[PDB]
Amino acid sequence: VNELSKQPTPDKAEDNAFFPSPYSLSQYTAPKTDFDGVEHKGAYKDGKWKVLMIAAEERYVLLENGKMFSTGNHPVEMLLPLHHLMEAGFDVDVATLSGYPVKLELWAMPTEDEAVISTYNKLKEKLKQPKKLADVIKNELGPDSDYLSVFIPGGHAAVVGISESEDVQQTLDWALDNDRFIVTLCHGPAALLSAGLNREKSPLEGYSVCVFPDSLDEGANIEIGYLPGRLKWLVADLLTKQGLKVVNDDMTGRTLKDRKLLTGDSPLASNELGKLAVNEMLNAIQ
Amino acid sequence: ELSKQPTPDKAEDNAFFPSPYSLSQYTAPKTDFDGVEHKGAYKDGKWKVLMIAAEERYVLLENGKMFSTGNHPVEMLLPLHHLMEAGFDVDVATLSGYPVKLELWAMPTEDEAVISTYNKLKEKLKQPKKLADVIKNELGPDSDYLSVFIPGGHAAVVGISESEDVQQTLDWALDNDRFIVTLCHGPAALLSAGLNREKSPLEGYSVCVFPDSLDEGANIEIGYLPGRLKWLVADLLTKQGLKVVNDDMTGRTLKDRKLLTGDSPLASNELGKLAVNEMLNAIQNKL
Structure with missing residues (x-):
């Protein structure tokens, strides 16, 4: 079990694209999460407030050497926070x-965790046929939106499309203008780069965040064959250059409120x- | 005996490639390509082809399974070989x-024409233009695009069939006398001309389309599809008139x-x- 290959495994659905190495899956994934119970089982009861998840729709990340990383949204990052929220009484829409x-x-799906797998099963229909984010902005936002917060889970695929979208931009500008939560972790914060699009100054300038670190993406992830190549830019770097x-x-599993x-790291x-x-x-329902 | 069972796709939940049997029947290491007919015929470097390609691989089916598909590499690359050899460059969106x-399971590995065309286009297939950037900067009446090309594969059914960007692209071609070239499930893209309108501008047009009877029947029984399509292209196009x-x-083509189109x-x-x-012929008409 320390003989496992350090080489990335090829994805046969795609040209020159690679899952993470069988060794890296041993160090970075697990059949069970650290989850041990929800705090607020059924605290909210009016059935009005909802979470809006903006999720990733492109699996493949093009790298510097021309190879592609077969990624996605990380499922623990998506599904664990959502277990907490749904159990507290907050329904979820996916876009x-x-x-x-x-x-x-799906290579990080903790197959043995009941809470995550049943969360995945309650969300399957919405994940397979999501809403279109432009349809959300047009019809379901504004000042009387029933969405209390925007959730952007991470995984490397969040780096793509979501980091340079005017539709994500408009969604962030709503949440600031209406005092709504933006919740995000991992590479999820690349989504935040969309706020500064076509603009001299981001309206998130002076916000503080947890971000997946540069040094791991450029070093350790590359040497254990998690990534098969170098990213062309890094999330923590470009968030800094936007202030x-x-x-x-x-x-460290660190979390932060600003x-x-x-945000989560x-x-x-x-x-x-x-x-x-x-x-x-x-706390904000008072 | 090859199995008629769909083959799982590791990358995605409850997703399947076509069954080995269906592959042995519907795919081949070689195309019937037997030469282009106008090598070097167009020599100004002005006119080009705008290809609109599929970017989603998974089709959700009537039974909850997903078809792992994409654009068909023969329907894509063989027509582009002819056009590129004739002197027309191509841009991918x-x-x-x-x-x-x-x-990629339909890729004829032994065919020099198709592999060659693929390797030239590799860069552009992996980093295409965005269709709306194209709409904003590269259409109008002085566009260097002489045709739009939409290839099939079952993936054309997704997105492209309900897109405002594809719609404006088709309006542009009608209004500036450009070609629209499509085949197989690709004509599903033409349903976009009818978005938010009582009457599609492509009403009365005659087309070749992959048949309803094969998707509903033979393709299911040999495990090419792992379940039924929720809607059928010929059926929806007929409903738009x-x-x-x-x-x-049978390899039928039509010009209207x-x-x-091709079937x-x-x-x-x-x-x-x-x-x-x-x-x-259109280039020779303008002199």
């Missing part, structure tokens, strides 16, 4: 930039970000 | 600028004004020939 199926990193305070440089921007931070989100959302 | 999803000209798959992967080679001749 992608085009209405395409949601792409997960955000990247409050961490390590991967006004209504709640990595997959390790999933279970806690779920608690933070539930807590801060029940 | 998708609806978001995501990479092009091909049905296009005339669907074929009920079978500047809309050139299936069988038509690929004759459609490239047909596009090239039509475009060369």
Whole structure:
């Protein structure tokens, strides 16, 4: 079990595209999460407030050497926080930039965790046929929106399309203008780069965030064959050049609240970000 | 005996490639390509082809399973070989600028024409233009695009069939006398001309389309599809008032004004020939 290959495994559906190495899956994934119970089982009861998830619809990330990383949204990052929220009484709607199926990193699916798998099963229909984010902006936002918060889970695929979208931009500008939560972790914060699009100054300038660290993406992830190549830019770097305070440089499961921007650093931070989100959302219903 | 069971796709939940049996029947290491007919015929470097390619690989089916598909690589690459050899360059667009999803299991590995065309286009297939950027900067009456090309594969059914960007692209071609060239499930893209309108501008147009009877029947029984399509292309186009000209798959092609179609992967080679001749003839008409 320390003889497992360090080489990335090819994805036969795609040209020159690679899953993470069998060794890296041993160090970074697990059949069970650190989850041990929800705090606020049924606290909210009016059935009005909802979470809006913007998820990833493109699985493949083009790298510097021309190879592609077969990724997706990380499923623990998506599904653990959502177990907390749904159990607290907050229903969930899923959107992608085009209405395409949601792409997960199914190689990180913790197959033995009941809470995550049943969460995945309650969400399957919405993941396979999401709403179109432009349809959401047009009809379901504005000042009387029933959406209390926007959730952007991570995984490497969040780096693509979501980081340079005017539809994501408009969605962030609503949540600031209506005092709504933006919840995000991992690479999820690349979504935030969309706020500064076609603009001299991002309206998130001076916000503080947890971000997956540069040094891991450029070093350790590349040497254990998790990524088969180098990213062409890095999320923590470009968030800084837009005037955000990247409050961490390590991967400790750290979480952070700054006004209504709640963030997590990595997959390790999933279970806690779920608690933070539930807590801060029940705190704003008064 | 090859199995008629769909083969799982590791990358996606409850998703399947076609069954080994269906592959042994519907795919081949070689195409019937037997040469282009107008090598070097167009020599100004002005006119080009705008290809609109599929960027989603998974089709959700009536039974909850997903078909792992993409654009058909023969329907794509063979017509582009003809056009490129004739002297027309090609630019690739998708609806978001995501990479092009091909049905890599249909890739004829032994065919020099198709592999060659693929390797030239690799760069552009992996980083396409975004169709709306194209709409904003590269259409109008002085566009260097002489045709739009939409290839089939079952993936054309997704997005492209309900897109405002594809709709404006088709309006542009009608209004500036450009070719629309499509085949197989690709004509599903033409349903976009009818978005938010009582009457599609493509009403009364006659087309070749992959037949309803094969998708509902044979494709299911040999495990090419792992379940039924929720809607059928010939059926929806007929409902928008296009005339669907074929009920079978035989490699039939049709020209109706500047809309050139073929019925299936069988038509690929004759459609490239047909596009090239039509475009060369249109260039000779303007002098």
